[PDB]
Swiss-Prot record, chains A, B:
Subcellular localization: Peroxisome matrix; Cytoplasm, Cytosol; Presynaptic active zone; Secreted
Predominant place of localization: other
Family annotation (InterPro entries): D-amino_acid_oxidase_CS, DAO, FAD-dep_OxRdtase
Consequence the record notes for mutating residue 38 to H: Found in a patient with ALS; impairs FAD binding; 20-fold decreased affinity for D-serine; 300-fold decreased affinity for D-alanine; 3-fold decreased affinity for D-proline
Listed result of changing residue 224 to F: Decreases activity
Family: Belongs to the DAMOX/DASOX family.
Name under which the protein is recorded: D-amino-acid oxidase
Associated pathology: Schizophrenia: A complex, multifactorial psychotic disorder or group of disorders characterized by disturbances in the form and content of thought (e.g. delusions, hallucinations), in mood (e.g. inappropriate affect), in sense of self and relationship to the external world (e.g. loss of ego boundaries, withdrawal), and in behavior (e.g bizarre or apparently purposeless behavior). Although it affects emotions, it is distinguished from mood disorders in which such disturbances are primary. Amyotrophic lateral sclerosis: A neurodegenerative disorder affecting upper motor neurons in the brain and lower motor neurons in the brain stem and spinal cord, resulting in fatal paralysis. Sensory abnormalities are absent. The pathologic hallmarks of the disease include pallor of the corticospinal tract due to loss of motor neurons, presence of ubiquitin-positive inclusions within surviving motor neurons, and deposition of pathologic aggregates. The etiology of amyotrophic lateral sclerosis is likely to be multifactorial, involving both genetic and environmental factors.
Region (Active site lid that may open upon substrate/product migration in and out of the active site and close to increase the hydrophobicity of the active site, to make the hydride transfer reaction more efficient): 216-228
Annotated phenotype, changing residue 120 to E/L: Increases activity and FAD-binding. Decreases protein localization to peroxisomes with protein mislocalized to the nucleus and cytosol
GO cellular component labels: cell projection; cytoplasm; cytosol; extracellular space; peroxisomal matrix; presynaptic active zone
Activity over temperature: Optimum temperature is 45 degrees Celsius.
Length: 340, 340
């Protein structure tokens, strides 16, 4: 069978890998190709810090809770494997700061060592009066993506750089299944008004003395829109920008300053941190992830489509559970073709 | 008054600074000079990771508990000051792992967010079945010492590189007070059989994905003698060697292997961590810190001596409280000379 994955961000490469893993032994030939117009260094995925953390509150689809946790559990089980620095996976503890009390997150038990911040800890952060501490996981995109590529390449999965203009063009080329993992740009293949960009900007800084993450929460500013600091392997991520509908892939001076001054306020030690880089990206915002099947009509033959996009600011957090769900959908397609 | 501080490790440079801070405004001239035979890069203090952590259990002198805490409190209050990276001071959380249950440490409340390790956390460390998690502080010697040197130099404190053969030679030179902060080598100046070296060796490794500390505890091997990993600013410290009475300042192959293999076991991700350096040093082991006065007789004139040594493996942990205690002792000397 001929499978075409459109997209080479986390969702794409993940799904690809997941499908190949689970079906390659059971499909006559399983021919999987990845089509993407941008690869690693240049994806939204490579701009992400990679911190595992879902939305605070119980969503539209609570199946997303399950997917985030399946991912957490999966990563945690390879955190101590000699392979982990190749996937850019490591454990990290830190703070969630709020101006007043709030309910414990659903995922409070998924993470390691969840607890409420003590007063002496809150004294370190004058502007916030309540919060949490826990241990979570960081999966760095730049690495993860490269890791995924290597696995895929070894499994015979071929990569092509191209902008796909239509599902039809791909089907007409003889794809049996199109897995659509196109992120913020999915609407160009099939209009989806519920999908929009959540523009972000981040700074990368040399501040290696920083061992914890600090995420602030501000109802006035909203999700992803208040100061955060997330230490990584080579560099500390400074962020706090969320701009719905903004399609400008250009670093903005005002946003730079907003990030810089919010983070320096959050942690004064930052003031002399050397700036290494700055990047913008597009969160594929949507009320729900679209993870589902669809048969495209096109010709005497109908083409099977697995949509897998709209993962907002929690795509690394959620990717594995989605990838496995995408894999079940594929297996169902096979059971229909009576190909297993 | 003429004061001679012997020693330019943390204890010396601290005490120096502390005495100058508190008395310079009240002493006609306060002439302070530091004599030391080795400075920064080459002190025991520069081989220390810098992790604040006292002995688990209530000691001989419980005044040491108060000193450790005064140091903790004092550091915590500057952790978020734009100055902190200059002293090499930062916050860091991590693990204490034991083979079975044990009582909470005395300092359980001094630290941030103390708690018992949960099962899922213990599953990460197959060889241990109990433990703690908390947040503490690291103060890196190489930096701290450099910071202390700069403060002192600005306060007119003069430094000389010399090996002092006797308290007498210093007193004869016209010192009014000798502050003895000679660490493991104090016995050469006045025999002290209770003082001995706790030889240590450490590796410094590039493992920047490592954001927590891990201290293991083994009654069979004893204090400082089982595997530890303590992330720093530029590098991760691998240790787990304690050899009482060993005066060999030479990296040992066996100990290297011991450290390497214990830490790799502790955290498999280390296996591909690049080795940056390796260093040995002498913990000035004693049943108690010697922090006290003594009048040397020498000639028609008696010389005042403040001893401040024997800080084992917790000198950075304890240094500030000792430094303030030494400063009181100095003030008392002044009140005797009726010089205030
Ligand atoms: C500032 C910022 C911080 C973030 N931080 C985190 C975090 O800490 N933790 C977390 O979980 N997530 C984080 N994210 C979220 C994460 O980056 C996204 O959810 C995720 O990267 C989206 O993955 P994707 O595969 O859906 O998209 P992408 O990585 O954008 O990949 C989409 C792919 O589709 C290709 N494509 C699109 N259209 C076509 C076409 N028509 N033809 C061919 N190819 C096409 C593109 O070239 C690209 O390969 C953050 C996002 C941003 C912007
Ligand atoms: C492997 C290892 C790991 C450690 N880890 C930690 C840790 O993580 N946290 C922590 O709290 N502490 C730690 N320590 C402990 C800390 O290193 C010591 O307690 C502390 O460094 C001792 O400080 P000092 O001033 O007492 O000795 P030093 O730093 O050795 O300074 C003594 C000074 O006296 C001078 N001197 C001696 N004799 C003479 C003389 N006769 N004439 C002139 N000068 C003289 C020397 O040149 C030197 O300048 C560690 C120690 C080791 C060895
Ligand atoms: O999009 C984002 N996603 C995240 C997910 C987890 C933790 C922080 C963030 C910050 C962002 O800017
Ligand atoms: O001497 C040491 N002192 C310490 C103090 C605190 C935590 C770890 C250590 C390890 C050592 O080897």
């Amino acid at each position: 069978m001929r499978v075409v994955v459109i997209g080479a961000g986390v969702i794409g490469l993940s799904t690809a890998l997941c499908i190949h893993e689970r079906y390659h032994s059971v499909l006559q030939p399983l021919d999987i190709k990845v089509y993407a117009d941008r690869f690693t260094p240049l994806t939204t995925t490579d701009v992400a810090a990679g911190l595992w953390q879902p939305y605070l509150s119980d969503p539209n689809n609570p199946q997303e809770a399950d997917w985030s946790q399946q991912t957490f559990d999966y990563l945690l089980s390879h955190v101590h494997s000699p392979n982990a620095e190749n996937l850019g996976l490591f454990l990290i503890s830190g703070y969630n700061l709020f101006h007043e009390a709030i309910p414990d997150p659903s995922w409070k038990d998924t993470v390691l060592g969840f607890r409420k911040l003590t007063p002496r800890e809150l004294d370190m952060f004058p502007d916030y009066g309540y919060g949490w501490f826990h241990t979570s996981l960081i999966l760095e995109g730049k690495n993860y993506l490269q890791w995924l590529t290597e696995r895929l390449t070894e499994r015979g999965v071929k990569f092509f750089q191209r902008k796909v203009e239509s599902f039809e063009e791909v089907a007409r080329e003889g794809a049996d299944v199109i897995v659509n993992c196109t992120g913020v740009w999915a609407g160009a293949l099939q209009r989806d008004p519920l999908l929009q960009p959540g523009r972000g900007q981040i700074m990368k800084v040399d501040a290696p003395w920083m061992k914890h993450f600090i995420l602030t929460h501000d109802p006035e500013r909203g999700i992803y829109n208040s100061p955060y600091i997330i230490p990584g392997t080579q560099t500390v991520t400074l962020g706090g920008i969320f701009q719905l509908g903004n399609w400008s892939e250009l670093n903005n001076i005002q946003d730079h300053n907003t990030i810089w001054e919010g983070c320096c306020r959050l942690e004064p030690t930052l003031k002399n941190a050397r700036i290494i880089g700055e990047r913008t990206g597009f969160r594929p915002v949507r009320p729900q992830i679209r993870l589902e099947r669809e048969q495209l009509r096109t010709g005497p033959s109908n083409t099977e489509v697995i949509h897998n996009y709209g993962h907002g600011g929690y795509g690394l957090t959620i990717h594995w559970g989605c990838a496995l769900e995408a894999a079940k959908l594929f297996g169902r397609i096979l059971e229909e073709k009576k190909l297993s």
